[PDB]
Design a protein around this ligand. Structure first.
Ligand SMILES: O=C(O)[C@@]1(O)C[C@H](O)[C@@H](O)[C@H]([C@H](O)[C@H](O)CO)O1
Ligand SMILES: O=C(O)[C@@]1(O)C[C@H](O)[C@@H](O)[C@H]([C@H](O)[C@H](O)CO)O1
Ligand SMILES: [Ca+2]
Length: 384
């Protein structure tokens, strides 16, 4: 790998700052957030970077009043290299007291498509949860009013403005589902043109061309609730999903035309039942797939970025622990992540972090770290 020859490079700093932090991120209206979770990042075709998160208004929990917030880099060519290269916090959508979340963007020339999950403010995944006003939630069910919805918003101005989200639940979620999720993290555009957005038990597929996309569903038996997808070097598709119970990632491979294998545990990739991220880095020699998750069967604090050179992404190297370049003052890093390739040939990653001030409870402040590093940084790590 010739990339090893470059001087190793890494920067890291908090980008979404929880309410407890000095420069706590708030909207221009003065609306702030206890916590930020569930990152998604894409570089646009202009080279601008767009970073999305769930703005969790009142506590760190998955339900209640949650707005879909974002930042862009100030210019198309700064690559988010320093804190001062990022705009202040903006909102994609925050209407009502329910949950707007699961950011899953994909870039198509230009247009940015952002798929989202939504639920009503009176419902939660388990039910029986107490909201700040004392209201008790109902469990997410199969009804229209009580199910998880799937929404699509678009930007045709490099993220500056977003269309009113369109509810595509009846079109792109199976009838009779209760819980649902899209991503979270990112979709992909294939070498052959199609858009592929990972979701619970399915891919959401955009055929046609840029400016004239048509969406449909590819069902995937045994896929996770929270999936990732990648075009591997052999031109095939690769789903690398969160398992239903802690242990290992689950993986399937296929195509849009012939469908997917069943899902099987990948014994090379331990996972604690948490979201991960995957990225197609490059197509020429040597081709590389990048993977990032907590490399642990029981902890989310063992973030490890890795590289596979295999045509089918079978096997990864050990890679490097993100703790080798730690951040201070933004909690204990580890959890959900998202990766993009910046216009200056770095990996750009968003990674969750947890102050743990309320332990596992609802009052623990959550922030999101932004990281850039070159392939040399990964490849020159101690156990690679
Ligand atoms: O941090 C988690 O693990 C979390 O709770 C955060 C997400 O907001 C939630 O939608 C997701 C979901 O509960 C699981 O995928 C099981 O369906 O996981
Ligand atoms: O989180 C909310 O609900 C909030 O308070 C803050 C949001 O940033 C804003 O978008 C939203 C909206 O104005 C109303 O919910 C009516 O749609 O008001
Ligand atoms: Ca709201």
């Amino acid at each position: 790998d010739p990339a090893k020859d470059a001087t190793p490079y890494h920067v890291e700093f908090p980008l979404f700052r929880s309410a407890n932090m000095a420069s706590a991120d708030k909207l221009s209206t003065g609306v702030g957030f206890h916590s930020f979770r569930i990152p998604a990042v894409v570089r646009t075709t202009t080279g601008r970077i767009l970073a999305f998160a769930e703005g969790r208004r009142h506590d760190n929990r998955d339900f209640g009043d949650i707005n879909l917030v974002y930042k862009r880099t100030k210019t198309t060519s700064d690559n988010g290299a320093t804190l001062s290269d990022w705009e202040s916090l903006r909102e994609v959508v925050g209407s009502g007291d329910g949950t707007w979340g699961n950011p899953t963007p994909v870039v198509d020339n230009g247009t940015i498509y952002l798929f989202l999950s939504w639920n009503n403010g009176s419902y939660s995944q388990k039910g029986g949860d107490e909201l700040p006003d004392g209201t008790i939630t109902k469990k997410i069910d199969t009804t229209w009013y009580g199910r998880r919805h799937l929404y699509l918003t678009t930007s045709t101005d490099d993220g500056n403005t977003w269309s009113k989200p369109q509810d595509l639940t009846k079109e792109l979620t199976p009838d009779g589902w209760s819980w649902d999720a899209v991503g979270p993290g990112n979709g992909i555009k294939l070498s052959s043109g199609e858009l592929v957005v990972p979701a619970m038990g399915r891919n959401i597929v955009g055929r046609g061309t840029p400016g004239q996309r048509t969406w449909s569903v590819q069902r995937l038996n045994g896929a996770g609730a929270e999936g990732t997808v990648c075009e591997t070097p052999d031109g095939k598709l690769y789903r690398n999903d969160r398992p239903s119970k802690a242990g290992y990632r689950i993986v399937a491979r296929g195509t849009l035309s012939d469908g997917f294998s069943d899902f099987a545990s990948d014994s090379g990739l331990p996972d604690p039942a948490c979201q991960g991220s995957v990225l197609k880095y490059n197509t020429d020699a040597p081709p590389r797939t990048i993977f990032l998750n907590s490399a642990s069967s029981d902890s989310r604090r063992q973030m490890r970025v890795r590289i596979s050179y295999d045509a089918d992404a079978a096997k990864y190297d050990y890679g490097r622990k993100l703790a080798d370049a730690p951040v201070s003052g933004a909690g204990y890093e580890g959890g959900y992540s998202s990766m993009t390739k910046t216009a200056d040939y770095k990996i750009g990653a968003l990674v969750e972090s947890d102050f743990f001030n309320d332990g596992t409870g609802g009052g623990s402040y959550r922030s999101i770290i932004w990281r850039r590093f070159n392939l040399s940084w990964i490849l020159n790590g101690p156990n690679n």
